[PDB]
Amino acid sequence: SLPKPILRVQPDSVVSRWTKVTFFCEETIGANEYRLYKDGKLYKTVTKNKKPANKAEFSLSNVDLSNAGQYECSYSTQYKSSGYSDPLKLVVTGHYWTPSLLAQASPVVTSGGYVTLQCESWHNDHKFILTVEGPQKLSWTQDSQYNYSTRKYHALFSVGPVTPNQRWICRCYSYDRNRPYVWSPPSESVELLVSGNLQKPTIKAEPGSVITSKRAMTIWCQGNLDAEVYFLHNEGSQKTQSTQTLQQPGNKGKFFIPSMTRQHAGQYRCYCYGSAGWSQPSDTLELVVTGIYEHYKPRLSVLPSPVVTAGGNMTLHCASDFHYDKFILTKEDKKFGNSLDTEHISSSRQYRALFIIGPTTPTHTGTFRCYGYFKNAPQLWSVPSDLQQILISGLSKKPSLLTHQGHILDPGMTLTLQCYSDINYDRFALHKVGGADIMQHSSQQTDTGFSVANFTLGYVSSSTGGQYRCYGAHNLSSEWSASSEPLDILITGQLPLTPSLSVKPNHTVHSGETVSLLCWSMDSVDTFILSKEGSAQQPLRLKSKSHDQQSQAEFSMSAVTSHLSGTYRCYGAQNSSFYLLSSASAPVELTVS
Ligand SMILES: *[C@@H]1O[C@H](CO)[C@@H](O[C@@H]2O[C@H](CO)[C@@H](O[C@@H]3O[C@H](CO)[C@@H](O)[C@H](O)[C@@H]3O)[C@H](O)[C@H]2NC(C)=O)[C@H](O)[C@H]1NC(C)=O
Ligand SMILES: *[C@@H]1O[C@H](CO)[C@@H](O)[C@H](O)[C@H]1NC(C)=O
Known part of the structure; x- marks a missing residue:
């Protein structure tokens, strides 16, 4: 007889227990009286007098289990009652056991497609309803099936066709046949990710793609600014939702991890949803977690x-x-x-x-x-x-070594190695033959007009004796220069044997004489070495032939000069260790006129 009224509810039709809800009866014709019916029975009646208005309210403060059912609204003007509004199911949650909800394979879905969701509950004879958080409340009703192989009771739902314009958030419910208006508490918020048809988002991890465990990191998903909410997902399944993102500069979905664990490694992909629709997934970014298995270091x-x-x-x-x-x-x-x-x-x-x-x-x-x-x-x-x-190394000028503080050292002296070159290299490197460690340092600009590198070694020990080489390169250049010809560092005071020295001619020779000098040891010695105080040059190393049981070696000097103040000490060594010398010998001062 009259225009049918409209029934509105705030909040939505499914409400939890002990929460306030308000029905609204809507019309603009007249307001002689409003009637709220529950399951075809007069529940309440509101009269608009004793302040006249246009729309009626019904407050159900603190809803209980008995309030669930079908609700309708009617109204009367003059003496004519006008039909019924379309019924509305008021549902209440509680009392039951919470179900779980899982994607059988993955929430990833091509637009215009379907996905299979397994809901699990422990009630035997229960009907299951899958719903979505959207304007058009879509519902699916299924029975409980039990696979003999899995030995579990659960139902499956095929959701779709998944349209790229609408965001999909699925929630599962279970209820008894004879008590339909009372559902189980809602399961987990399972959101679907749609492989859209729009622009791809760029994905990055600013700390890097390889992170040691127990540390923090961040993941950025940037892209088209049509997007409202950003998501992250793994092939080893995860779902992370970021609705409010950093606005400056532009929509950049930030995700933060305080400490990496087992579940945080794997192949990550950013998905995006916007007003225009979902987007194509990002490229696969592999996140690696190191640090685990922290006993057997390789x-x-x-x-x-x-x-x-x-x-x-x-x-x-x-x-x-x-x-x-x-x-x-x-x-x-x-x-x-x-x-x-x-x-x-x-x-x-x-x-x-x-x-x-x-x-x-x-x-x-x-x-x-x-x-x-x-x-x-x-x-x-x-x-x-x-x-x-x-x-x-390979191709450039060889950076020769200064090798100052002498050529042979006794323990323990502080040794330094300086490396120079004609070309103004910006960086120098030092390495010992037969080793595994390399040293590098930035060169300083000297007064002469080129670069030199200062290298400080520690306590001269048994191990510091060997063969050393140096290399040079520029700041921008990745190609290093060929090494200099080898420096031989020798250590004395290592072998128990101790030689002594002598000379053949007079001490005060003229500056044109010849001077042969000899040092031997009764114990076995393979090679002998002659050393001068402050000898800038490499010492000569000579073979040993045994006259008697003693091992000796003559050092001849031809065309001697007064520039050579003299030769002072003699050391020994063997083929067993070519660079490890014996102890010192008796000093002998020579003079040349
Ligand atoms: C890197 O370290 C070396 C270590 O030798 C520095 O070499 C310096 O070289 C000059 C001469 O080339 C030395 O000067 C000397 O001073 C004494 C008095 O102290 C004087 O009797 C000598 O006749 C000579 O003039 C200087 O002592 C020596 N060491 C230092 C610390 O200056 C070199 O300067 C260091 N820096 C660079 C960029 O290579
Ligand atoms: C060249 O680059 C290295 C590395 O940053 C730096 O140590 C050095 O100061 C730079 N310039 C010079 C003149 O050494």
């Missing part, structure tokens, strides 16, 4: 030398006593190369990995660290090995 060696010339073969050796599956090399803190299988060696009780690089390009100069990991956890790595640095 060890890294290099063959043949940590410094190689351009155009050679270089073998890196990553080994460990522990049964890892694969090893991976990292230049700087970034990736390089690829993974290789471990190899159980019978003799050395080791698990080995042999990384081949040939030829050696100047780009290989860097800081390599090898990690170990397993096949079933490709992103969970071991502890970084003690790093191995690599330098490559």
Whole structure:
């Protein structure tokens, strides 16, 4: 007879227990009386007098379980009651057991498609309803099925067709047949990610793609500014929702991780939703967590030398006593190369990995660290090995070494090595033959008009004796210069044997004489060495033939001069150790007129 009224509710039709709700009856015709019906029975009646208005209110303060049911509104003017508004289901939650909700495969879905969601609840004979948080409340009703293989009771829903214009947030409910108006508490907020058809977002991790465990990091998803909410997801499944993003400058979805654990590694992809619709997924960014398996640290060696010339073969050796599956090399803190299988060696009780690089390009100069990991956890790595640095020389002027503070040293003296060159190199490097450590320093500008590098070594010990080389390069240049001809550092006071010295001619010779001098030892000595106080030159090393049981060596001097004040001491050495000298000898001062 009259225009049918309209029924509105605030908030939405599904309300939790002990929460205030308000019905509104809407019309603009007349207001003689309003009637609220519950399940076809007169529940309440409101009269608009004793202040006249246009729309009626019904407050159900603190809703309980009995308030759930179908509600309708009617109104009367004069003496004519006008039909019924379309019914409205008021549902209340509680009393029951909370279900769980899972994506059977993944929430990723192509636009205009369907996804399968498994809801799980422990009630035997229950009907299940899957709903979405949207304007048009879409519902799905299914029965409980139990797979004999899985030995579990649960239902499945095919949601769709997933349109890219609407955001999809799914929630599951379970209810008894004979009590339909009372549902279970809502399950987890399961949101779907739609592979849209718009512009791709750029993804980054500013601390890096390889992070040691227990540390913090950030992930940025930037892109089209049509977006409102940003998401992150993994193939090893995660879902993270960021609705309010950093506005300056522009929509940049920031995600923060305070400490990396097992679940935080894997392949990440940013998804995006906006007013125009969903977007194509981002490129796959692999996040790696190291630090786990913090007991058996791997060890890294290099063959043949940590410094190689351009155009050679270089073998890196990553080994460990522990049964890892694969090893991976990292230049700087970034990736390089690829993974290789471990190899159980019978003799050395080791698990080995042999990384081949040939030829050696100047780009290989860097800081390599090898990690170990397993096949079933490709992103969970071991502890970084003690790093191995690599330098490559070849083409430029040789930077000769000053090698000051003498050529032979007794323990313990403070040794320094200065490295100079004609070309104004901005950076110098030092390395000992047969070693694994390399040293680098920035050159200072001297008064002469070129660059020199100051190198401070520690206490001269048994190990400091050997062969040393230096290299030079510019600030921008990645190619290093060929080394200088080798410096031989010698250590005395190491062998128990002690020689002595003599000369043949007179002490006060004229400046044109010849002077042969001799030092021998009754014990076995292979080579002998002559040393002068402050000898800037390399000392001469001579072979030993045994006259009697004593081992000796003559040092001849031809065309002597007064510039040579004299030769003072003699040392010994053997073929067993070419650079480790014996103790000092009796000094002998010479003079030349
Ligand atoms: C790097 O360290 C070296 C270490 O020798 C510095 O070399 C300096 O060289 C000059 C001469 O080339 C030395 O001067 C000397 O001073 C004494 C008196 O102190 C004098 O009797 C000598 O005739 C000579 O003039 C100087 O002592 C020496 N050491 C220092 C600390 O200056 C070099 O300057 C350092 N810096 C660079 C950029 O290489
Ligand atoms: C060249 O670059 C290195 C590395 O940043 C720096 O140590 C050095 O001060 C720079 N310039 C000079 C003149 O050494």
